[PDB]
Design a protein around this ligand. Structure first.
Ligand code: UFT
Ligand code: UFT
Lengths: 258, 258
């Protein structure tokens, strides 16, 4: 059998951040990551508080926050601890190792000081991971590698996707899984998180493509759905989050045998 | 014959930002872009002022500035106008179109308000360019596409590089050239800018690889060298910049027939 999230949390080679995430997914019956794509701190924090019980993870783009300060992120941490979710900065690092370490630790945002997870593109080669890990390992953080993208014309296919998987294997002390559209690794230690998710068929006018939670989790074998506009643009964002949570959770149970 | 920078500035299909850059390269006898990889505003501005006459372009990572404010960038603009160089934010956008437009226009940094040029990875497909251009076209800006990377294990090779070139062709109203290690397009309208440049052989401990200006400009056919540590770590950064300027310029002249 495929192992439950709770059993995967105990695997010998599991990363501590992956284990914490898997435990809380199991406890809370949620494999939903909220993509909190808003430009105001007040809305970010109001969403994190109201939707915290429904999510395993809150994904940020702090570079879109108009009123970012480090005190906003301290508050977000308080909510993350209160409601039990991880914070994932969706920074999609994509430069040489020497540069991404600086971008991860420093500047105004100090990402590594508050983000449990970040992600990186594999296009620069494995130095991108080596650079991030210089900062992230001492801070006990984890990283996801972008093995596939949800957008039209994505070049993250075929051998590129295979290279991402190898790179994750080779840096398993820091890399905890993937951003992908589907299961890309057979090794249950790795998490699969999938953006490009809505209940209805469609896309946007700038290349985004959507697939349903049942497709993504149930048929394609991914672990967590990442949902932005499907929730954020809804009138009642709490009920929307609950719809997405129930869809992804039941897809997971049905794949497990439950 | 290959056309001089001055003649390329007049090509029918030249982008206005490319034409301004080419004119100033010609006027100033410089095809050097300073990679101003420092974490303090005072050092950024002191370098921009002292090295401004020697450079065609100053490349930033504002996400590494510890004391970024928009008033720092206004000052940098003053120096850019005074010394005649373009400002290039090396943000290496790599998300879906809807997201990168937000990251380009908004947040704390307001990149599009002060950067003449930005760059983007092609991995997401052409929506990345469509999203940036939503913001950049009305602001009269330009973009470079990352067709090749300088780092060990780069996946930006073969068909990936070819896709970058096609994508540039298809968005020539906004895309003015490439970040690459070599000439990748035959069309003289496109600029080639090459990072991974030092006078001496070597690399760093996080995957960077260096080639010389003579190799990059003279043999590989690129237009502009991008140099960070080769200048920034030197004691006399002005003399280092002049060494790099003379190397790249003479390589260009010798390729032209001069
Ligand atoms: C990143 C990588 C990828 O493959 N797709 C993708 O959409 N992203 C980011 O994920 C969310 C999707 O939000 P949406 O549900 O509103 O389309 C965005 O934040 C995007 F940046
Ligand atoms: C970006 C893309 C790429 O292919 N290579 C590369 O180095 N970058 C960026 O360019 C400079 C190189 O600086 P250096 O001369 O000190 O190595 C860095 O800012 C890096 F981010």
């Amino acid at each position: 059998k495929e192992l439950s999230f709770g059993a995967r949390a105990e695997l010998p080679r599991i990363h501590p951040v992956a284990s914490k995430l898997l435990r809380l997914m199991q406890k809370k019956e949620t494999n939903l990551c909220l993509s909190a794509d808003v430009s105001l701190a007040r809305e970010l924090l109001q969403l994190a508080d109201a939707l915290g019980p429904s999510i395993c993870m809150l994904k940020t783009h702090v570079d879109i926050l108009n009123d970012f300060t480090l005190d906003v992120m301290k508050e977000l941490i308080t909510l993350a601890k209160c409601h039990e979710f991880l914070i994932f900065e969706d920074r999609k690092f994509a430069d040489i190792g020497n540069t991404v370490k600086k971008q991860y630790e420093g500047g105004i945002f100090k990402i590594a000081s508050w983000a449990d997870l970040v992600n990186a593109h594999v296009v620069p080669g494995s130095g991108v991971v080596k650079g991030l890990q210089e900062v992230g390992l001492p801070l006990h953080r984890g990283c996801l590698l972008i093995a596939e993208m949800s957008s039209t014309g994505s070049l993250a296919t075929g051998d590129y996707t295979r290279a991402a998987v190898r790179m994750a294997e080779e840096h398993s002390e820091f890399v905890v899984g993937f951003i992908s559209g589907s299961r890309v690794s057979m090794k249950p230690e790795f998490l699969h998180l999938t953006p490009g998710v809505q209940l209805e068929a469609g896309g946007d006018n700038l290349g985004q493509q959507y697939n349903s939670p049942q497709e993504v989790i149930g048929k394609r074998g991914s672990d967590i759905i990442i949902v932005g506009r499907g929730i954020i643009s809804a009138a009642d964002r709490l009920e929307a989050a609950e719809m997405y949570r129930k869809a992804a959770w039941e897809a997971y149970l049905s794949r497990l045998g439950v």
